[PDB]
Amino acid sequence: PPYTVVYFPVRGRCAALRMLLADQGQSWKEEVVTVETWQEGSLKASCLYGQLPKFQDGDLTLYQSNTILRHLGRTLGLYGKDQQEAALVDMVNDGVEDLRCKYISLIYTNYEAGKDDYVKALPGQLKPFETLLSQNQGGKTFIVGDQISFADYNLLDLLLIHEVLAPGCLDAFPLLSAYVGRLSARPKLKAFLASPEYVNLPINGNGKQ
Amino acid sequence: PPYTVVYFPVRGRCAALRMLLADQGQSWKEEVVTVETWQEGSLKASCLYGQLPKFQDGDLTLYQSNTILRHLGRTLGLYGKDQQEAALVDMVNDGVEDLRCKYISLIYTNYEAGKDDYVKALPGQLKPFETLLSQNQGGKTFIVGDQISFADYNLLDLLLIHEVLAPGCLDAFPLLSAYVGRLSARPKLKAFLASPEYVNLPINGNGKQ
Numbered sequence: 001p002p003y004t005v006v007y008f009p010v011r012g013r014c015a016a017l018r019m020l021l022a023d024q025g026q027s028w029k030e031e032v033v034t035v036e037t038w039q040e041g042s043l044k045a046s047c048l049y050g051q052l053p054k055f056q057d058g059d060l061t062l063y064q065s066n067t068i069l070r071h072l073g074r075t076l077g078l079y080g081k082d083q084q085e086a087a088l089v090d091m092v093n094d095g096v097e098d099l100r101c102k103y104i105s106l107i108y109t110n111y112e113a114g115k116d117d118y119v120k121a122l123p124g125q126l127k128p129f130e131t132l133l134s135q136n137q138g139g140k141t142f143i144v145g146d147q148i149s150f151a152d153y154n155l156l157d158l159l160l161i162h163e164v165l166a167p168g169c170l171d172a173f174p175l176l177s178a179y180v181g182r183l184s185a186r187p188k189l190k191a192f193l194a195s196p197e198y199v200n201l202p203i204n205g206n207g208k209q
Numbered sequence: 210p211p212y213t214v215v216y217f218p219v220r221g222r223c224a225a226l227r228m229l230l231a232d233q234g235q236s237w238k239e240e241v242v243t244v245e246t247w248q249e250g251s252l253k254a255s256c257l258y259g260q261l262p263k264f265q266d267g268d269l270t271l272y273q274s275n276t277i278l279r280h281l282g283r284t285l286g287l288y289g290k291d292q293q294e295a296a297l298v299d300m301v302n303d304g305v306e307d308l309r310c311k312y313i314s315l316i317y318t319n320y321e322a323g324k325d326d327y328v329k330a331l332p333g334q335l336k337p338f339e340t341l342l343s344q345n346q347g348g349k350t351f352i353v354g355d356q357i358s359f360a361d362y363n364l365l366d367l368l369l370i371h372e373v374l375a376p377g378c379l380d381a382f383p384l385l386s387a388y389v390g391r392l393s394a395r396p397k398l399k400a401f402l403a404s405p406e407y408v409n410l411p412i413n414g415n416g417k418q
């Protein structure tokens with residue numbers, strides 16, 4: 001198997017790259033890291049920024065989830081068909097990252113106090129991606145151009161975890177909803193999304209969702 | 210003039226890309242947006258994510274500073290020599306981003322209370338970049354490979370603003386220090402870093418630093 005994913009037993013910042021790997025018919029080894037292993041200290045100390053995911057593609061070793069996604073996109077043709085489209089994919093993914101940061105802050109540092117304000121503010125954070133969809137072939141293909149990209153898998157995961165956090169949060173965004181259903185029903189992705197290696201994992205690392 | 214930058218009269222999220230543009234001998238028109246004009250509300254409602262910088266290259270239009278950086282590096286040859294080096298540059302820029310986010314957070318939401326602990330934690334946040342330099346040509350060329358990349362400009366700007374925040378914070382990191390000196394000696398970049406266009410601006414939108 002060409003790829004190794006080294007992460008905690010969490011969906012987290014690895015859910016999107018896992019989706020990408022599964023939907024593209026790739027195989028990969030999961031190295032699961034428990035609390036005991038991480039506290040041991042040597043794995044962490046070997047990690048560039050002392051964090052996970054760690055990712056192996058042959059004898060290339062990568063850290064940072066967004067770096068990993070861009071890498072897979074580069075080498076599996078999921079980065080747009082020209083340089084202009086590649087910039088657009090960078091835009092979209094960076095917006096996805098900003099919102100994911102806000103989500104992670106809510107989850108890990110302010111769930112009970114912040115959830116109401118967060119759900120009240122969420123439609124403003126989702127409207128940019130519906131605008132994006134509506135300007136690209138009526139939103140009936142992918143988020144950028146007419147072929148799938150790594151930003152699609154990233155945006156999809158962000159949308160799914162938000163539909164967990166605030167159910168019905170996509171009712172006001174018909175295009176984003178049809179987009180979730182369409183990408184979710186792709187066959188290899190569907191299979192992965194229903195497998196135990198996905199369902200048995202919590203979204204996050206602190207029991208909140 | 211091919212390029213248009215549309216950001217507040219600040220350095221902020223634009224200091225790096227400007228640096229790159231100046232160092233590559235590029236010309237660009239600056240459109241300056243005051244807080245009064247911003248607070249009017251129209252330009253903000255036309256911004257994809259409600260933020261600036263907004264960037265125009267021909268009739269391609271971009272938002273997000275990292276998107277702009279990656280686009281400039283893709284089109285100017287500052288994004289590695291092969292796919293592996295591009296992935297390493299990504300890994301570096303994302304590390305830079307994380308630290309930049311911590312810095313932005315401090316600067317805007319907790320300067321007085323949080324500066325002391327920010328400074329105490331800074332060496333561990335810098336140690337990875339010292340390690341990277343030590344494994345690429347003795348730290349005596351660039352952060353990745355043997356030619357400059359957009360990650361170099363973003364990292365340089367990060368280090369400069371941290372030296373202003375924590376004087377001598379590079380005392381313990383000889384390679385990062387010599388790096389700041391070397392890249393700043395580059396002719397076009399030195400010229401730009403002493404010009405009024407750069408010098409007359411505050412590091413951040415709220416004058417803290």
Ligand SMILES: *S(=O)(=O)c1cccc(S(=O)(=O)N2CC(Cn3c(-c4ccc(Cn5nc(C)c([N+](=O)[O-])c5C)o4)nc4cc(C(=O)NC)ccc43)C2)c1
Nearest residue numbers: 217218219221222243244260261313314317318413414415
């Ligand atoms: S850049 O101008 O420094 C910049 C950095 C990050 C984000 C942006 S922005 O999205 O385009 N945007 C403009 C405004 C930043 N800003 C402010 C200001 C003071 C307090 C806040 C609220 N806030 N902003 C940020 C980034 C956070 N945060 O914690 O992440 C918070 C809570 O914004 N004041 C400003 C004054 C000027 C100016 O014209 N000075 C002479 C410019 C920008 C600016 C948020 C921009």
Ligand SMILES: N[C@@H](CCC(=O)N[C@@H](CS)C(=O)NCC(=O)O)C(=O)O
Nearest residue numbers: 013050051052053064065066205307
């Ligand atoms: N910027 C990183 C963030 C990864 C991250 O913070 N992961 C957490 C998992 S909850 C972690 O590594 N925590 C361990 C630590 O910092 O010791 C990425 O995108 O990969």
